[PDB]
Structures are given as structure tokens and as C-alpha cells.
Amino acid sequence: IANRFTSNIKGLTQAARNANDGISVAQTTEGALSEINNNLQRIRELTVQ
């Protein structure tokens, strides 16, 4: 049972690290998207003009 618990603990720690990496991916993509949105807003203002 101690061996099983050790396996579970190590797996869960590594899984937490993987989830942190996923959060990083999402943050980067969302920053790029925000820049794209600003560009689109400026384009719409130009078209209105």
C-alpha cells in the first residue's frame, strides 16, 4: 500500500506541473488574441470613417 501511495503521489505532482503548463499555453494564446481584437476594433473605426 505504501508503494501504491508513492506512485499516486508522484503521478499527481507531475500532473499538477502539466496543468500549470496548460495554463501557460492558454495565457499566451489569449494575449495574442487580445492584440488581434485591438487591431480589429481599429479597423472597424477606420471603416466607419
Binding site: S7, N8, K10, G11, L12, A15, N18, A19, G22, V25, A26, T29, L33, I36, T47
Partner: protein
């Protein structure tokens, strides 16, 4: 995200560019609707 097989979370990505948003020939400096000239006998016979 888990310690066993199958414990996965999926992030869906979308191809964002001009093509998937339209805007390709976003030709705002164009001419728009233009009234065409009336036909005449010369091009009437030119048509055959």
C-alpha cells in the same frame, strides 16, 4: 491531469486568420454599385 490513463483535458484551438474571418477582398476603396451605360447599335452588332 490524473495519475492514471485517460485523465485528460482537451483545449480546442481554432485557425484564426483573414481566411476564417472573411475580409479577404475587403476592398473598401472600391467603386460599389455602378450604373452601366446604355447599349447602342455598334456593340449591338458587335455582339453578333
Amino acid at each position: 491531469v490524473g495519475a492514471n490513463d485517460g485523465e485528460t483535458i482537451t483545449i480546442d484551438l481554432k485557425k484564426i486568420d483573414s481566411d476564417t474571418l472573411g475580409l479577404n477582398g475587403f476592398n473598401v476603396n472600391g467603386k460599389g454599385t455602378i450604373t452601366n451605360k446604355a447599349a447602342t447599335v455598334s456593340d449591338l452588332t458587335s455582339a453578333g
